[PDB]
Amino acid sequence: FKEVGIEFMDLYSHLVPVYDVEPLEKITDAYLDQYLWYEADKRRLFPPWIKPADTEPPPLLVYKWCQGINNLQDVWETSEGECNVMLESRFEKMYEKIDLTLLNRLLRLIVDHNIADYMTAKNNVVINYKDMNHTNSYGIIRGLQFASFIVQYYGLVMDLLVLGLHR
Amino acid sequence: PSYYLKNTNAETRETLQELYKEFKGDEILAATMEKKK
Amino acid sequence: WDDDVVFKNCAKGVDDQKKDKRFVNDTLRSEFHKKFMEKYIK
Amino acid sequence: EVVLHEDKKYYPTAEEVYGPEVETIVQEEDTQPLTEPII
Amino acid sequence: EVMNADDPDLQRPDEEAIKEITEKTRVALEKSVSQKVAPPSPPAPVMHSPSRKMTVKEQQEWKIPPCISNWKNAVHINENFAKLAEALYI
Amino acid sequence: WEKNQIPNRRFTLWWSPTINRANVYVGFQVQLDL
Amino acid sequence: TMPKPQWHPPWKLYRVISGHLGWVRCIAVEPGNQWFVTGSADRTIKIWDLASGKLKLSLTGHISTVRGVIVSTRSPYLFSCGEDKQVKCWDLEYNKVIRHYHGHLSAVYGLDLHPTIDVLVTCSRDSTARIWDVRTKASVHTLSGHTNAVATVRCQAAEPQIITGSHDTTIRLWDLVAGKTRVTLTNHKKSVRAVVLHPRHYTFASGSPDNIKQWKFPDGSFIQNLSGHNAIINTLTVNSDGVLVSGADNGTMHLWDWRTGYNFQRVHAAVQPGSLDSESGIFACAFDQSESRLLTAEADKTIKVYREDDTATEETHPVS
Amino acid sequence: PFDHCSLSLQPFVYPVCTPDGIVFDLLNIVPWLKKYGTNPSNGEKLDGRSLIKLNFSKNSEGKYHCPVLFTVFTNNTHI
Amino acid sequence: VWRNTEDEILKAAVMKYGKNQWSRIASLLHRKSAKQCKARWYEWLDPSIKKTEWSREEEEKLLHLAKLMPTQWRTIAPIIGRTAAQCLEHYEFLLDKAA
Amino acid sequence: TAQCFLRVDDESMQRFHNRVRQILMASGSTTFTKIVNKWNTALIGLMTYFREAVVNTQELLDLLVKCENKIQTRIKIGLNSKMPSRFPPVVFYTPKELGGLGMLSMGHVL
Amino acid sequence: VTKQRVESHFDLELRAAVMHDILDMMPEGIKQNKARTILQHLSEAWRCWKANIPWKVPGLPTPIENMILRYVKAKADWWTNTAHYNRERIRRGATVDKTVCKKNLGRLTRLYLKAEQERQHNYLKDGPYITAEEAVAVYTTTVHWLESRRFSPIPFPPLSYKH
Amino acid sequence: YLTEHPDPNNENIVGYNNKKCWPRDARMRLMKHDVNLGRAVFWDIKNRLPRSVTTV
């Protein structure tokens, strides 16, 4: 494909990238993304706990989470020396470390190989900024219309790593 | 090798046996990666 | 439990990596710069 | 083996390039605050 | 001469002279500063060396290629990639 | 209300008689001579 | 062609400091060998303990490079000067600027405090030098005449009190009080940056790309042409026992004996880890007060410290 | 405190103390000492054997009170 | 697409102006955009684009790579010195004569 | 069985403050109408999302009053340059159908 | 000197320092070594450092090149350190400006893109960091899960598609 | 976990971070059973993620 142009937008506290794809490839990606999400939903790929979900705005999510903690079994009992632990973190670099070919295999597990090769190959482009260039062959380009599906996928994979298939 | 790797499953174990059986060094990248003194 | 997880402890021998105690006289690769980039880009 | 990108060092070390005896120092900060007199 | 001809010929005149001159200059400096507060000289002979002219060798050895500007107008692949892709095919 | 060039001169005008109450601001009585 | 040159034991590198984030342009030692001051192009000014080699303090004075500093032996004052067109004075009990002598037009390059008359003498790339009252921010003389940047000054009690060497390749000796030119020397071909005054021989040497030259006071009598360290020379420092040090621009440090002018050592130093060799360089030197150890501030953000060599004998190191 | 652990850092059940005095339980520092030859009190190596049994009195309320003095132990008193 | 006339004007404009001001250049021809000029030059026009048929060794390398690094053509094409377009279609051609 | 206490988080109050600073800095050319629009919008973006943690966060409330009053000062120095005393507030808080600016206020309360 | 003229000033001082130093040492091009041209090459070396393009003009007398590299390294390091400092100001809120905001944005991106170009090329030269065991573990474990979720793999979107 | 990283001088108090917005009695309290549990759990989690793919 062609090459995308990058530039940073500034929140005074940490810059954040902002890309730009060509128009034709924009349209194609937009379509592919609606499609992928529509199916993936219909076939229940993303299990429930992958949770910027469609049904609830974030604050309702907070309420849901609280009262979930509440309805556990004997959660507040501390008699026999139990202890509860709530831990929360980031993944600290997921985008920049998605590895292209292995991602290609992990997509071939989900979609057909033509869609899969489309996605993987599109993530490999030349990144422009007024004079500098390079070919983005390690990370993933958050800015393409279907970066969301890929990220939520790679998430679920590492989720299975943290939980373990049993749980 | 399979240190760091608790709980080798059957097909991973198999794939690893077969790879360490079958793979010896390639040439194209070995060339890809002399200076007249 | 725990019978099925995939990676036993990977932090066995990572003894703090004393690069953060090196000093490198080269701007674009000093530890100060690396950490400052880590902070200010997303 | 392999060395992740944050773990690689391209520059030979100070003790490597100077020798055994050279008592090399690094100092990022000071031993004092601004108020306490040195005089 | 190029040797240690006369060490005291070189040795610095006496501290006592510096104190008297220092006080003299101190007061003179006070006088000028206090007063202000209230075609140059001929060229001295150039006691110089002669030049030893520029050979062709260094005459070109300090030749400087002009400004050909990319702006101004007016790979190696590690081999473990093989291991990885082969393993995944298996 | 509306259901080179200048800034919000219209807003300045329309709220004039409150932004020139000489009580607010204080100072001269510099009337336009004309 | 000379009496057999004396034997001075060589010098070995032993301790290396790396704390700055720019070139180290100047360095001075405190009267009592307890700590030394460094001024860099990182705009910091850093005070270091001389023994533990540990950074005792840092202070963010200037706006640009600190091109030179000097500590007072008659007071707890410390005078800085930099290419920010400005000169400052610090009290070192309260660690603060106390007066700033405005007046120059461009980058100060160097300065010295007169040992007895309480004045400063500062040289600047604006083709002049000036004489400053210590306290009252008063400049009594614009010692003028060099056709270009007065690359350095040194001042001393005896006549003449002020020697300034320049990029005009000239040297000029001035009467302090009349503030007038007394004498010129113009032997040199390429600019002259380093001038140093002997402690007990009423003499002084000047360095330039050609080679060092030596002179006898108060007149400017040429004495003895010193050659061998053919590189842009940046500081000369002379020791009690007649050991004379020329730090060159490109790292190559050369040693000689003051008497015979006998270049008896070449040290060719090794750069830090990350610094390309082309960034090698020496920018200033200074012996400690007790004159046992030697500080050199290099052009790769490091401060190297050399020590007299103890295992040296006439057979370990002959004189030739 | 008086009855608080060094390794687990909570109520210790059986007194088994290193001969110096900064005490702990053997049933607590057991896996730490068995899997690492040293302990948390000192970085230097340790032998498990010298950690000797101790038994503290139970008193009228059940408090840990001095066997001979009967005085009640709190977070502060010398042991 | 590109016509030989626009092509020649491109050659001359580049050799005059240097590779860095594509705005002036694209201003020259009508119905041409600066992005397109840049792309075309680096893709086809620039002299460094080696225009010959594939050696046996070049095809060995190509095939081997495209097996090593699936579908990453802008990663491969520098390693064998052709454009992504050349590598792409030519690998397609080898694949079709095989099957 | 239990009570949950909400309170806006630092990172988020901080990004609010930055949004306002961004208003001030970038807009020196814009009219008062555009300024007050960016303000209104930042505000409801805060309230209608947080909605209860806000009232429960004193420090936020201080921030809100400080920032508001700061942008009122920006339109005031918009007329003249001489700072004027008093200043009738109506001309800010009046709906835009009556030709005010209609800025939504969150501060007058104690 | 005031924050306005800091840049123009320091630049002046740098260019003149270069002039003094080399074009009093390097000559024996005695007439004038076309200093002006050596300074054009200075500027170009800078430009290329800013755009991450290896500037390598071969015919330069190595000592002259040594000087130029000393000086560009000085200047670029100054650039960086002032970027660190301005961004800390702007994050601390200390002050506003419509320039020192756009300027710092530009500088800070260029520093980033340089870091990136580095990190990609490093990945290529140092091979995938996710060895092969980890790759196979991840892959196989995903397959286990999906199959245990009877997940019908999505098919390439037919043309005469309902929706 | 303590086997894996014996902290002899009880520094596990300083490295910890608790919320500093609230009053004193609303933040996290430093009881050594707690703090050690805190680090021990997180360390167990981090140990499941290959450093090369992601991390915490």
DSSP J25-87: HH-SSS-HHHHHHHHHHHHHHHHHHHTTTTTT-HHHHHHHHHHHHHHHHHHHTTSSSS--SS-
Q: Is G151 helix (H, G, I), strand (E, B) or coil?
A: coil
Residues contacting residue J69 through CB under 8 Å, at least 6 positions apart? J107
Sketch the domain layout of chain I as residue ranges.
Answer: 1-49, 50-99
Element holding J9 (H helix, E strand): none
Q: Provide the 8-state DSSP code for A139.
A: S
The answer to whether G182 touches G171, Cβ cutoff 8 Å, is no
| Contact residues of K toward J, CB < 8 A | 93, 96-98, 101
K93: left (phi over 0), alpha (psi -120 to 50) or beta: left
Strands G152-155 vs G139-141: parallel, antiparallel or unpaired: unpaired
Crossing angle for the helix pair I73-80 and I84-98, to the nearest 10 degrees: 90
Q: Quick one: residue E13, left, alpha or beta (phi over 0 = left, psi -120 to 50 = alpha)?
A: beta
Who's near G38: CB < 8 A, 6+ residues apart? G20, G24, G26, G27, G45, G46, G47, G48, G69, G297, G303
CB-based contact L56:L45 (threshold 8 Å): yes
Is the sign of the CA dihedral C24, C25, C29, C30 positive or negative? positive
Angle ∠(E51,E52,E56) on CA atoms, nearest 5:
130
Q: Of I77, G22, J19, which Cα lies nearest the Cα of K76?
A: G22
Nearest to D25 among G17, G47, G57 (CB): G17
> Which amino acid, one-letter code, is at F6?
I
Residues ≥6 apart with Cβ < 8 Å to K60: E64, E65, K41, K68
Question: Is F31 buried (19+), middle (13-18) or exposed (0-12) by CB count in 10 A?
Answer: exposed
Residue C38 backbone dihedrals phi, psi, to 5 degrees: -55, -35
Query: Phi and psi dihedrals of K124, rounded to 5?
Result: -70, -40
Label residues E30-62 b or e (16+ Cβ within 10 Å = b): eeebeeeeeeeeeeeeeeeeeeeebeeeeeeeb
| Residue K131 to residue F26: CA distance in whole angstroms | 78
Q: Is the dihedral of CA A8, A10, A15, A18 positive or negative?
A: negative
Q: Does residue G48 contact residue G320 with C-beta atoms inside 8 Å? A: no
- SS3 label, residue G277: helix
The 3-class secondary structure across K70-113, one letter per residue, is: HHHHHHHHHHHHHHHHHHHHHHCCCCCCCHHHHHHHHHHHHHHH
Contact B12 K140 (CB under 8 A): yes
A100 contacts on I by Cβ (under 8 Å): 69, 72
Identity of residue I66: A
**What are the residues whose beta carbons fall under 8 Å from the beta carbon of G86, sequence distance 6 or more?**
G62, G63, G100, G101, G102, G104, G108, K1
Beta bridge partners of J21: none
C-alpha I46, offset from chain centre = 9
- C-alpha distances (whole Å) from A149 to each of F3, J50, K19 are 43, 28, 58
String of DSSP letters for G3-26? SPPP----EEEEEEEE--SS-EEE
User: Comparing C-alpha atoms, which of G299, G242, G243, G292 is closest to residue G269?
Assistant: G299
H1 Cα to chain L: minimum distance (Å): 11
- Cβ neighbours around J30 below 10 Å, total: 15
Q: Positive or negative, the Cα torsion across K152, K155, K159, K163? A: positive
**Do G233 and G193 meet the contact criterion of CB atoms below 8 Å apart?**
yes
* CA pair distance C25, D12, nearest whole angstrom: 12
- Residue of chain K minimizing CA distance to A108: K153
Helices (H), chain I: 4-17, 22-28, 34-40, 56-68, 73-80, 84-98
CA E34 to chain centre: 38
Partner residues linked to G37 by β-bridges: G28, G47
Distances in whole angstroms, Cα of residue J83 to Cα of each of F10, G288, J74, J76, K150: 21, 61, 11, 7, 72
Q: What is the resolution of this structure in A?
A: 3.4
Q: How far is CA G262 from CA G13, G184, G224, G259, I74, in A?
A: 21, 27, 11, 8, 64
Please compute Rg for chain E using Cα positions: 36
The crossing angle, in degrees rounded to 10, of helices J10-26 and J32-50 is: 170
- CA of E84: which chain A residue's CA is closest? A102
Nearest 5 degrees, angle CA K65-CA K68-CA K69? 85
Q: Using CB atoms, list chains with 3+ pairs below 8 Å to chain E.
A: A, B, G, I, K
A-chain residues within 8 Å CB-CB of I35? 2
Kindly identify which residue of chain K lies nearest to residue E84, measuring between CA atoms: K132
Longest CA–CA separation in chain G, Å: 58
SS3 A118: helix
Alpha carbons G169 and C17: distance in angstroms, whole number = 53
Contact G158 E2 (CB under 8 A): no
DSSP secondary-structure letter at I45?
Answer: I
DSSP 8-state symbol, D29: S
Query: Which residues of J sit within 8 Å Cβ distance of L?
Result: 7, 10, 59
Selected residues 34-53 of chain L with any CB under 8 Å from a CB in chain K: 50, 52-53
Q: By the 8 A CB rule, do A128 and A5 touch?
A: yes
Strands D23-26, G11-18: parallel, antiparallel or unpaired by DSSP? parallel
Decide: helix, strand or coil at residue A42. Answer: helix
Q: Within an 8 Å CB–CB cutoff, is residue K122 touching chain D?
A: yes
The two most distant CA atoms of chain K are separated, in Å, by 85
Q: How was this structure determined?
A: cryo-EM
- Pull the structure tokens for residue A115: 């869609």
The candidate with the shortest Cα–Cα distance to G266, out of G252, G287, G249, is G252
Strands G77-82 and G87-91: antiparallel
Q: Is the dihedral of CA G144, G150, G153, G158 positive or negative?
A: negative
> Cβ(G237)–Cβ(G198) under 8 Å?
no
Say yes or no for a CB contact (<8 Å) between C10 and B5.
no
DSSP conformational letter for A129 = B
Is the distance from CB of G149 to CB of G135 less than 8 angstroms? no
Q: Whose CA is closest to G42, among G305, G303, G253, G276? A: G303
Comparing CB atoms, the residue among E70, E75, E77 nearest residue I20 is: E70
Q: Which chains does chain D touch, 3 or more C-beta pairs < 8 A?
A: C, G, K
Residues D28, D11: Cα–Cα separation, whole Å = 19
Ramachandran region, residue I2 (left: φ > 0; alpha: ψ -120 to 50; beta: rest): beta
- Token readout for G21 is 């984030």
A120–I71 C-beta distance less than 8 A? yes
Place of tokens 């009877």: K150
A114 closest CA partner among K137, K153, K148:
K153
L/I Cβ contact: 3+ pairs below 8 Å: no
- Measured from the Cβ of residue A125, the count of other Cβ atoms closer than 10 Å reads 22
Chain A residues whose C-beta is within 8 A of a chain E C-beta are 101-102, 105
CA distance K160 to L9: 72
Nearest to G189 by CA among K27, E40, K61, E2: K27
Nearest to A140 by CA among A123, A121, A158: A123
Q: Which residue of J86, J90, J93, J98 is the best one to mutate when testing the F interface, meaning the one whose CB has the most F CBs within 10 A?
A: J86
B&K contacts, CB < 8 Å: 22
User: Is E85 touching I (CB cutoff 8 A)?
Assistant: yes
Tokens representing residue G237 in the block: 């420092």
What is d(CA G215, CA G195) in angstroms, rounded to the nearest whole number? Answer: 11
Say which residues have a Cβ less than 8 Å from residue G178's Cβ, sequence separation at least 6: E28
Determine whether the interchain pair F19/J91 forms a contact, defined as Cβ–Cβ distance below 8 Å: yes
- Give the span between the Cα atoms of E9 and G94, in whole angstroms: 47
User: What residue ranges in K4-153 does DSSP mark as E strands?
Assistant: none
K64 touches K38 (CB < 8 A): yes
Q: What tokens does G190 get?
A: 């390429």
Residue linked to tokens 């070139």: G23
Which one, of G77, G34, G79, lies nearest residue G52 by Cα? G34
* Cα Dmax for chain B: 53
